[PDB]
PDB file of all heavy atoms in Angstrom:
ATOM      1  N   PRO A 219      42.512-156.018-116.901  1.00  0.00           N
ATOM      2  CA  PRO A 219      42.353-157.469-117.027  1.00  0.00           C
ATOM      3  C   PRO A 219      42.787-158.244-115.790  1.00  0.00           C
ATOM      4  O   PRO A 219      42.364-159.382-115.584  1.00  0.00           O
ATOM      5  CB  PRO A 219      43.202-157.799-118.257  1.00  0.00           C
ATOM      6  CG  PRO A 219      44.251-156.714-118.263  1.00  0.00           C
ATOM      7  CD  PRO A 219      43.431-155.499-117.927  1.00  0.00           C
ATOM      8  N   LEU A 220      43.633-157.626-114.971  1.00  0.00           N
ATOM      9  CA  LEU A 220      44.103-158.245-113.731  1.00  0.00           C
ATOM     10  C   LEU A 220      43.090-158.048-112.605  1.00  0.00           C
ATOM     11  O   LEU A 220      43.155-158.715-111.573  1.00  0.00           O
ATOM     12  CB  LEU A 220      45.448-157.644-113.323  1.00  0.00           C
ATOM     13  CG  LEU A 220      46.704-158.472-113.593  1.00  0.00           C
ATOM     14  CD1 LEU A 220      46.622-159.206-114.927  1.00  0.00           C
ATOM     15  CD2 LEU A 220      47.916-157.565-113.527  1.00  0.00           C
ATOM     16  N   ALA A 224      38.848-158.958-115.878  1.00  0.00           N
ATOM     17  CA  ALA A 224      38.997-160.399-116.059  1.00  0.00           C
ATOM     18  C   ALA A 224      37.702-161.077-116.480  1.00  0.00           C
ATOM     19  O   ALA A 224      37.754-162.109-117.140  1.00  0.00           O
ATOM     20  CB  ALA A 224      39.542-161.055-114.791  1.00  0.00           C
ATOM     21  N   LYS A 263      49.183-165.122-118.696  1.00  0.00           N
ATOM     22  CA  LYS A 263      48.307-165.428-117.577  1.00  0.00           C
ATOM     23  C   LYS A 263      46.925-165.737-118.131  1.00  0.00           C
ATOM     24  O   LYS A 263      46.512-165.166-119.143  1.00  0.00           O
ATOM     25  CB  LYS A 263      48.224-164.256-116.597  1.00  0.00           C
ATOM     26  CG  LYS A 263      49.328-164.255-115.557  1.00  0.00           C
ATOM     27  CD  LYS A 263      49.046-163.206-114.520  1.00  0.00           C
ATOM     28  CE  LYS A 263      50.040-163.246-113.392  1.00  0.00           C
ATOM     29  NZ  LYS A 263      49.712-162.154-112.420  1.00  0.00           N
ATOM     30  N   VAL A 264      46.244-166.701-117.521  1.00  0.00           N
ATOM     31  CA  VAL A 264      44.905-167.050-117.963  1.00  0.00           C
ATOM     32  C   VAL A 264      43.938-166.341-117.023  1.00  0.00           C
ATOM     33  O   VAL A 264      43.948-166.574-115.812  1.00  0.00           O
ATOM     34  CB  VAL A 264      44.666-168.586-117.958  1.00  0.00           C
ATOM     35  CG1 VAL A 264      43.280-168.900-118.485  1.00  0.00           C
ATOM     36  CG2 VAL A 264      45.719-169.293-118.808  1.00  0.00           C
ATOM     37  N   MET A 265      43.162-165.414-117.575  1.00  0.00           N
ATOM     38  CA  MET A 265      42.204-164.650-116.787  1.00  0.00           C
ATOM     39  C   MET A 265      41.068-165.485-116.231  1.00  0.00           C
ATOM     40  O   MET A 265      40.592-166.423-116.870  1.00  0.00           O
ATOM     41  CB  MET A 265      41.649-163.480-117.596  1.00  0.00           C
ATOM     42  CG  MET A 265      42.306-162.148-117.270  1.00  0.00           C
ATOM     43  SD  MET A 265      43.952-161.940-117.933  1.00  0.00           S
ATOM     44  CE  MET A 265      44.958-162.491-116.691  1.00  0.00           C
ATOM     45  N   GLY A 266      40.633-165.121-115.032  1.00  0.00           N
ATOM     46  CA  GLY A 266      39.558-165.838-114.373  1.00  0.00           C
ATOM     47  C   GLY A 266      40.094-166.876-113.408  1.00  0.00           C
ATOM     48  O   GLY A 266      39.330-167.651-112.843  1.00  0.00           O
ATOM     49  N   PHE A 267      41.413-166.883-113.223  1.00  0.00           N
ATOM     50  CA  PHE A 267      42.076-167.824-112.327  1.00  0.00           C
ATOM     51  C   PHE A 267      43.081-167.109-111.435  1.00  0.00           C
ATOM     52  O   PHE A 267      43.813-166.243-111.895  1.00  0.00           O
ATOM     53  CB  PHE A 267      42.795-168.908-113.134  1.00  0.00           C
ATOM     54  CG  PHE A 267      41.868-169.817-113.888  1.00  0.00           C
ATOM     55  CD1 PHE A 267      41.432-169.482-115.165  1.00  0.00           C
ATOM     56  CD2 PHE A 267      41.390-170.986-113.301  1.00  0.00           C
ATOM     57  CE1 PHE A 267      40.531-170.294-115.842  1.00  0.00           C
ATOM     58  CE2 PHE A 267      40.490-171.801-113.970  1.00  0.00           C
ATOM     59  CZ  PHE A 267      40.059-171.453-115.240  1.00  0.00           C
ATOM     60  N   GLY A 268      43.101-167.475-110.155  1.00  0.00           N
ATOM     61  CA  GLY A 268      44.028-166.870-109.212  1.00  0.00           C
ATOM     62  C   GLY A 268      43.455-165.692-108.446  1.00  0.00           C
ATOM     63  O   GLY A 268      42.500-165.047-108.875  1.00  0.00           O
ATOM     64  N   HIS A 269      44.063-165.388-107.310  1.00  0.00           N
ATOM     65  CA  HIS A 269      43.600-164.289-106.486  1.00  0.00           C
ATOM     66  C   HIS A 269      44.706-163.883-105.529  1.00  0.00           C
ATOM     67  O   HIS A 269      45.465-164.735-105.064  1.00  0.00           O
ATOM     68  CB  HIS A 269      42.370-164.725-105.695  1.00  0.00           C
ATOM     69  CG  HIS A 269      41.593-163.585-105.128  1.00  0.00           C
ATOM     70  ND1 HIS A 269      40.491-163.055-105.758  1.00  0.00           N
ATOM     71  CD2 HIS A 269      41.780-162.847-104.008  1.00  0.00           C
ATOM     72  CE1 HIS A 269      40.031-162.038-105.051  1.00  0.00           C
ATOM     73  NE2 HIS A 269      40.795-161.890-103.986  1.00  0.00           N
ATOM     74  N   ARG A 270      44.796-162.587-105.235  1.00  0.00           N
ATOM     75  CA  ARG A 270      45.816-162.089-104.321  1.00  0.00           C
ATOM     76  C   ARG A 270      45.628-162.615-102.903  1.00  0.00           C
ATOM     77  O   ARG A 270      46.607-162.893-102.203  1.00  0.00           O
ATOM     78  CB  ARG A 270      45.829-160.555-104.309  1.00  0.00           C
ATOM     79  CG  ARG A 270      46.631-159.917-103.148  1.00  0.00           C
ATOM     80  CD  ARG A 270      48.092-160.348-103.126  1.00  0.00           C
ATOM     81  NE  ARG A 270      48.781-160.040-104.374  1.00  0.00           N
ATOM     82  CZ  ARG A 270      49.291-158.848-104.675  1.00  0.00           C
ATOM     83  NH1 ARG A 270      49.191-157.840-103.816  1.00  0.00           N
ATOM     84  NH2 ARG A 270      49.900-158.666-105.840  1.00  0.00           N
ATOM     85  N   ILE A 315      45.969-173.760-109.810  1.00  0.00           N
ATOM     86  CA  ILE A 315      45.311-172.474-109.583  1.00  0.00           C
ATOM     87  C   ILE A 315      43.821-172.646-109.880  1.00  0.00           C
ATOM     88  O   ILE A 315      43.442-173.110-110.958  1.00  0.00           O
ATOM     89  CB  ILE A 315      45.899-171.367-110.497  1.00  0.00           C
ATOM     90  CG1 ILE A 315      47.384-171.165-110.193  1.00  0.00           C
ATOM     91  CG2 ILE A 315      45.167-170.065-110.288  1.00  0.00           C
ATOM     92  CD1 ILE A 315      48.063-170.159-111.095  1.00  0.00           C
ATOM     93  N   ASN A 318      38.449-167.832-110.181  1.00  0.00           N
ATOM     94  CA  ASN A 318      37.927-166.813-109.290  1.00  0.00           C
ATOM     95  C   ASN A 318      36.529-166.458-109.784  1.00  0.00           C
ATOM     96  O   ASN A 318      36.065-167.007-110.783  1.00  0.00           O
ATOM     97  CB  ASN A 318      38.850-165.581-109.187  1.00  0.00           C
ATOM     98  CG  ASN A 318      39.197-164.964-110.537  1.00  0.00           C
ATOM     99  OD1 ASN A 318      40.369-164.840-110.884  1.00  0.00           O
ATOM    100  ND2 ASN A 318      38.192-164.535-111.273  1.00  0.00           N
TER     101      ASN A 318
HETATM  102  C1  COA C 401      44.891-162.141-109.242  1.00  0.00           C
HETATM  103  C2  COA C 401      46.410-162.352-109.413  1.00  0.00           C
HETATM  104  C3  COA C 401      47.085-161.000-109.759  1.00  0.00           C
HETATM  105  C4  COA C 401      46.979-162.900-108.064  1.00  0.00           C
HETATM  106  O1  COA C 401      47.997-162.065-107.483  1.00  0.00           O
HETATM  107  P1  COA C 401      49.536-162.639-107.284  1.00  0.00           P
HETATM  108  O2  COA C 401      49.541-164.089-106.710  1.00  0.00           O
HETATM  109  O3  COA C 401      50.375-161.669-106.426  1.00  0.00           O
HETATM  110  O4  COA C 401      50.038-162.614-108.840  1.00  0.00           O
HETATM  111  P2  COA C 401      51.437-163.262-109.396  1.00  0.00           P
HETATM  112  O5  COA C 401      51.699-162.798-110.849  1.00  0.00           O
HETATM  113  O6  COA C 401      52.626-162.897-108.459  1.00  0.00           O
HETATM  114  O7  COA C 401      51.080-164.894-109.329  1.00  0.00           O
HETATM  115  C5  COA C 401      51.968-165.832-108.661  1.00  0.00           C
HETATM  116  C6  COA C 401      52.558-166.863-109.621  1.00  0.00           C
HETATM  117  O8  COA C 401      51.500-167.680-110.153  1.00  0.00           O
HETATM  118  C7  COA C 401      51.251-167.419-111.550  1.00  0.00           C
HETATM  119  N1  COA C 401      49.826-167.122-111.793  1.00  0.00           N
HETATM  120  C8  COA C 401      48.881-166.420-111.021  1.00  0.00           C
HETATM  121  N2  COA C 401      47.671-166.486-111.751  1.00  0.00           N
HETATM  122  C9  COA C 401      47.988-166.997-112.863  1.00  0.00           C
HETATM  123  C10 COA C 401      47.073-167.102-113.949  1.00  0.00           C
HETATM  124  N3  COA C 401      45.834-166.638-113.788  1.00  0.00           N
HETATM  125  N4  COA C 401      47.545-167.664-115.066  1.00  0.00           N
HETATM  126  C11 COA C 401      48.805-168.167-115.052  1.00  0.00           C
HETATM  127  N5  COA C 401      49.709-168.032-114.049  1.00  0.00           N
HETATM  128  C12 COA C 401      49.294-167.434-112.933  1.00  0.00           C
HETATM  129  C13 COA C 401      52.132-166.201-111.920  1.00  0.00           C
HETATM  130  O9  COA C 401      52.601-166.171-113.286  1.00  0.00           O
HETATM  131  C14 COA C 401      53.235-166.214-110.844  1.00  0.00           C
HETATM  132  O10 COA C 401      54.178-167.193-111.299  1.00  0.00           O
HETATM  133  P3  COA C 401      55.751-167.283-110.613  1.00  0.00           P
HETATM  134  O11 COA C 401      55.877-168.712-109.880  1.00  0.00           O
HETATM  135  O12 COA C 401      56.814-167.137-111.815  1.00  0.00           O
HETATM  136  O13 COA C 401      55.897-166.073-109.558  1.00  0.00           O
HETATM  137  C15 COA C 401      46.705-163.414-110.529  1.00  0.00           C
HETATM  138  O14 COA C 401      46.306-164.734-110.128  1.00  0.00           O
HETATM  139  C16 COA C 401      46.176-163.035-111.958  1.00  0.00           C
HETATM  140  O15 COA C 401      46.829-162.197-112.656  1.00  0.00           O
HETATM  141  N6  COA C 401      45.045-163.613-112.388  1.00  0.00           N
HETATM  142  C17 COA C 401      44.471-163.270-113.694  1.00  0.00           C
HETATM  143  C18 COA C 401      43.665-161.963-113.589  1.00  0.00           C
HETATM  144  C19 COA C 401      42.360-162.240-112.883  1.00  0.00           C
HETATM  145  O16 COA C 401      41.648-163.231-113.180  1.00  0.00           O
HETATM  146  N7  COA C 401      41.872-161.261-112.177  1.00  0.00           N
HETATM  147  C20 COA C 401      41.371-161.474-110.763  1.00  0.00           C
END
Side-chain angles (χ1 to χ4, degrees):
Chain A
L220 257 39
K263 274 189 175 179
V264 183
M265 260 75 268
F267 293 87
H269 197 96
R270 166 58 57 82
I315 298 177
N318 54 237

